Design a protein around this ligand. Structure first.
Ligand SMILES: *[B@@]1([O])O[C]([C]C([O])=O)C2=C1[C]=C(OC1=NC([N])=NS1)C([C])=C2[C]
Lengths: 244, 246
């Protein structure tokens, strides 16, 4: 079903980046990628895990409803941008790791395992601690699997209420225009080492007029200055494809 | 209770327009307006009616689901942007009048009347033709009632499924940033004369950090060139209030 577009490599070789972009028009049955081998290779999801984690938090009642406020206790957090009260959309958009570590703790291992099985989420390996498995643990997911998962969310076909899927979808909106709407989420596991790099992601979908395009990007990253390429490489490819 | 902030009148007089802005922080119990008399005055909703019309279309099954495509029959429409197949969000955002005239026809008078009673939607007067009552008919709604209605939608408290309310809410998103989100809808009944003006609206809500602001603006419009003031006057007021900007 998946085809290779070697012209998309221009955008990767120019920045000396080892990565993959998977782009699907209408459904995950019609996908194209720059690298067929890397398209199914599995990596730590990092903050892209906030999408299933938010759905699970709502499903289990850990997150009361769409208007739940996650209060800051005034005690130090890793990022200044996290040192404030956040809505569910705010906590997803600023990628507030401690908010989601607390949700994962409240969900617990049994319920987390059950939902990742329901969602067919990567290797479904939640070893490495309940509040760390997606950051430094054993959980791995491919770009192809991210697209399949996002397509299910878009269609309200995940094993969750349509209401909870709709709440998480509005939380994912990053661009809005009269005939163009983007839902997306970034991820970054850190810079690792040279030989064992970290991973950076950008996943989501574009609704342009009456068409839908699902996408998932990942790349090896050992230098934090390369981080914006997680959005600029996929954007340049979608621009060359006329999606914009 | 609703309070008057007459210091906002300079934003209207600067442009020689007659209008009202209603702004509520957290809930419709804490509102402020430049003009208490006009805040309760009822006007044709024009395209702001696409919000209840879309909810009613979903509730009645006239609109199948969130991914319903409204096909273009290839016949001339007033705007080039309307001459194409549209999604529900697309039809609301481009304000495609003919799509909603067809939804209203399919909903019909009895069902339309029942839902406008459930929603406490203005004067609930749908006379003037089933496909025209909100454009040139007898339907009227105030800026205060728009804020009450929008607050109910935000809280999923309208007499409709939470699912249908959530679908219409995503269709209304017009601005998105990590800690700033806007849901809004414009309306314009058509240009009138100075003595018999048309009405232009801008209604919606702003979610900024963990706060919510409900708003409704309307103005008399007697010159087509004044139409963008329906967004620039409320924007200047929200800027002076500290909602827009840091
Ligand atoms: B996450 O993937 O998104 C943010 C970073 C961003 O670019 O928005 C973020 C994510 C995870 C994360 O926590 C981590 N823990 C480990 N062990 N590796 S990454 C952090 C710190 C941030 C900022």
């Amino acid at each position: 079903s998946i085809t290779e577009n070697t012209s998309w490599n221009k955008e990767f070789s120019a920045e000396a980046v080892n990565g993959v972009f998977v782009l699907c028009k209408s459904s995950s049955k019609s996908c194209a990628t720059n690298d067929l081998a890397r398209a199914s290779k599995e990596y730590l999801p990092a903050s892209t895990f906030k999408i299933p984690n938010a759905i699970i938090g709502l499903e289990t009642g850990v997150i009361k409803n769409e208007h739940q406020v996650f209060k800051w206790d005034g005690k130090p957090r890793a990022m200044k941008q996290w040192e404030r009260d956040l809505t569910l959309r705010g906590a997803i958009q600023v990628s507030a790791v401690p908010v989601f570590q607390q949700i994962a703790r409240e969900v617990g291992e049994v319920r987390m395992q059950k939902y990742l099985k329901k969602f067919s989420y990567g290797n479904q390996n939640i070893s490495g601690g309940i509040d760390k498995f997606w950051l430094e643990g054993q959980l791995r997911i491919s770009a192809v699997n991210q697209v399949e998962f996002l397509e299910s969310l878009y269609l309200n076909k995940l094993s969750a209420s349509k209401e909870n899927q709709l709440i998480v979808k509005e939380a994912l909106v990053t661009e809005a225009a009269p005939e163009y709407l983007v839902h997306s989420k970034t991820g970054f596991s850190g810079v690792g080492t040279e030989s064992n790099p970290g991973v950076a992601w950008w996943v989501g979908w574009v609704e342009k007029e009456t068409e839908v395009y699902f996408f998932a990007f990942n790349m090896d990253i050992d230098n934090e200055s390369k981080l914006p390429l997680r959005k600029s490489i996929p954007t340049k490819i979608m621009e060359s494809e006329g999606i914009i």
